[PDB]
Amino acid sequence: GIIQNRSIFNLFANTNIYIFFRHWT
Amino acid sequence: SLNEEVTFFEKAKRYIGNKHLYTEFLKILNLY
Amino acid sequence: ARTKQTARKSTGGKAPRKQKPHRYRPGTVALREIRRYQKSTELLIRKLPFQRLVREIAQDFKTDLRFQSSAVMALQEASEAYLVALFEDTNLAAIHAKRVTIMPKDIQLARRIRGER
Amino acid sequence: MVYEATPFDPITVKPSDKRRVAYFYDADVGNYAYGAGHPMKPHRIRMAHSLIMNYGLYKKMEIYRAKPATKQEMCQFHTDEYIDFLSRVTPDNLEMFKRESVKFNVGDDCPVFDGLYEYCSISGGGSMEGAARLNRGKCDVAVNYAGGLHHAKKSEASGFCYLNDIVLGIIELLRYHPRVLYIDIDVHHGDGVEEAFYTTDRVMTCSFHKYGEFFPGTGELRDIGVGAGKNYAVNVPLRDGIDDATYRSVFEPVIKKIMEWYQPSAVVLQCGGDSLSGDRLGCFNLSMEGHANCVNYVKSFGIPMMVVGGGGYTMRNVARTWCFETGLLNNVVLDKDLPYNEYYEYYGPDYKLSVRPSNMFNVNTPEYLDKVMTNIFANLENTK
Amino acid sequence: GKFLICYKCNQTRLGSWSHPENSRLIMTCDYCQTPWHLDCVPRASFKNLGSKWKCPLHSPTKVYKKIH
Amino acid sequence: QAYNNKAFKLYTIDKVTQSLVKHAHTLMTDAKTAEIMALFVKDRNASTTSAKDQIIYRLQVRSHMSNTENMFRIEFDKRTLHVSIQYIALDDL
Amino acid sequence: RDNIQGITKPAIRRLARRGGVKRISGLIYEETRGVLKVFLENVIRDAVTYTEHAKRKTVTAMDVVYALKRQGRTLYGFGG
Ligand SMILES: [Zn+2]
Ligand SMILES: [Zn+2]
Ligand SMILES: [Zn+2]
Secondary structure (H helix, E strand, O other): OOOOOOEEEEEEEEEEHHHHHHHOO | HHHHHHHHHHHHHHHHOOHHHHHHHHHHHHOO | OOOOOOOOOOOOOOOOOOOOOOOOOOOOOHHHHHHHHHHOOOOOHHHHHHHHHHHHHOOOOOOOOEEEEEEEEHHHHHHHHHHHHHHHHHHHHHHHHHHEEEOOHHHHHHHHOOOOO | OOOOOOOOOOOOOOOOOOOOOEOOOOOOOOOOOOOOOOOOOOOOHHHHHHHHHOOHHHHOOEEEEOOOHHHHHHOOOOHHOOOOOOOHHHHHOOOOOOOHHHHHOOOOOOOOOOOHHHHHHHHHHHHHHHHHHHHHOOEEEEOOOEEEOOOOOOOOOOOOOOOHHHHHHHHHOOOOOOEEEEEOOOOOOOOOHHHHHOOOOOEEEEEEEEOOOOOOOOOOOOOOOOOHOOOOOOEEEOOOOOHHHHHHHHHHHHHHHHHHHHHOOOOEEEOOOHHOOOOOOOOOOEHHHHHHHHHHHHHOOOOOOEEOOOOOOOOOHHHHHHHHHHHOOOOOOOOOOOOOOOOHHHHHOOOOOOOOOOOOOOOOOOOHHHHHHHHHHHHHHHHH | OOOOOOOOOOOOOOOOOOHHHOOOOOEEEOOOOOEOOOOOOOOOOOOOOOOOOOOOOOOOOOOOOOOO | OOOOOOOOHHHOOOHHHHHHHHHHHHHHHOOOOOHHHHHHHHHHOOOOHHHHHHHHHHHHHOOOOOOOOOOOOOOOOOOOOEEEEEEEEEOOO | OOOOOOHHHHHHHHHHOOOOOOOOOOHHHHHHHHHHHHHHHHHHHHOOOOOOOOOOOOOOHHHHHHHHHHHHOOOOOOOO
């Protein structure tokens, strides 16, 4: 189940990085 | 056929949710 | 036949148009709060109402008159000082006539004898 | 699956739909004023007309001064006592009529100015002569901005309206036409016209109005007429801030379905300028293109029509949109550069023909208008 | 502190303040407090004054029936 | 005047950029917050990862902060730069 | 105008309470407000007259205590 040359990248975050990213968007 | 006929009322009660809305639903079915 | 108009409306429906608990005796709390407003030092007229008073009352003498913030505070203080002296004089002219309650007639005499009526 | 979200296409005239246009204007209409603090101004009529003359639109149309209506021509719809009160009341003898002031709703929100009877006579005469010229075939489009009083009723004055001239015009149209369709794009509901023709199938009254807690309160979707007039009174309730694309995607399917279902012989179009953005009392977000697209779309059907101007309480915007609508009826699009008129100082700061929409929320959701147009289309199935 | 779920659509369309046109207006019944969207029951006003607004789920206090 | 009131959302550009700046400042200078971004750095820089790496990265992010906090799965796809954000607050516990 | 009733009935009681008064008639308040305004227009007429003397268009606490000085009463901590 190895996913080589991946294209979908996941960022797991708390409220701080989420609110920072929401302000960026 | 029979099972849906006997199971219609309490599955309707489950779909209604709030007991006040089911009370008014039974009031509607009584007024009919 | 005398008649008068009060509706003051030529047409009706103007809105629909397109255009056990303790109780201290009567008098008991008052002396407790005589002392509260006497040991205290704040100014007893609310600043926003009094500020608005000085603005609305000064406009007729001169148009567009601005007041320094400290200027109205000097007025606030001077007026409270003026009224507490007049009210001591009131209490004195009231206790004169075998009374505890004051009545305006007390303070028209208090002003008349001080020479501003 | 009835409402479709479509962007507002640019207004294009049809060169194969040339219409003889009759213009009804009495130079006096403007010299009347409701009051000092009043929003309704008949002065908007003559600055609209000054834009017609200075655009050179009088060379493509005939200007008429309609004969003012007498007392008993007004009584074709209204009662004798209401017209008798209207023709006799002045601001001087207002105390002599106190019972009639509250009886006929005249004195507050419909004030007594001393040119009231003459203003109503000009409006009613303009509407009736436009309908008469449509009847005899002397013109294909009759333009009369002097009227539009769609709120007036049989024995009352409401909504700054005293003489319901639109009912008189539809009455004059009914003597020669079997089916007359009345379209009201005024932001208020055409309660007087709909109430007048509620029980008849000869007149279909369609109203595109804001329906909230707004004047006149009538205009629920369930109001479809009673008796023989059932499903012959279409009410389209709208929310605040409807823009040009939304209003077009509501107006064009409904009017198209009425056209191919009711099949009228004459059309009366109430062009209320209070549907425009920035109105004093209106709450819509229509630009002048959005207001005039209704007039251009109803012009495409070829039915002999009577363009009658109604509301509009900011004079500049209603004058500009009436000038653009009038120019559209001559199969021309007026350039967005105003000519020099005597009221040029109103149209600042750009002094152009355009009425700019506000950036306020179009709260008319597609689901709500889809349900509204679905029930309207379902009610229209019985009008064949 | 929970979300007022509309009865018919079983959703609350709160919107996002970047697409406020995605927010559907919601009102509550004045009797049983059942929240309804402004589009699920066909309504354009919010019923701010006048009579209390009644949601469609309540049994009528007055009905007319045909004799036939 | 330039945009015919269609640029009203740009009236507070200074305040929103200031708030973004403040959020970045408390983003690096908070305990149990900067190591989450360090784990994001290790996940993004080291490509060719299987699923099991993704779950252990998820619980390793979870173990950094409190048990009552909210997680967010901000998915990015190189093709199309499409950022899907998912709410898994107290869901993987 | 609107602010003359802004001098409220408890405030007048507070002035009276600071003044040692136990019982107060109901008719005290409005004519006491009148006595307050006659005093205010007098003092501010003097203060503003001092203000347009100075080629000025604001009155100052200095001008207030100056008017008070003319009227006879002096206030401290407000300049002067
Ligand atoms: Zn209107
Ligand atoms: Zn819903
Ligand atoms: Zn309810």
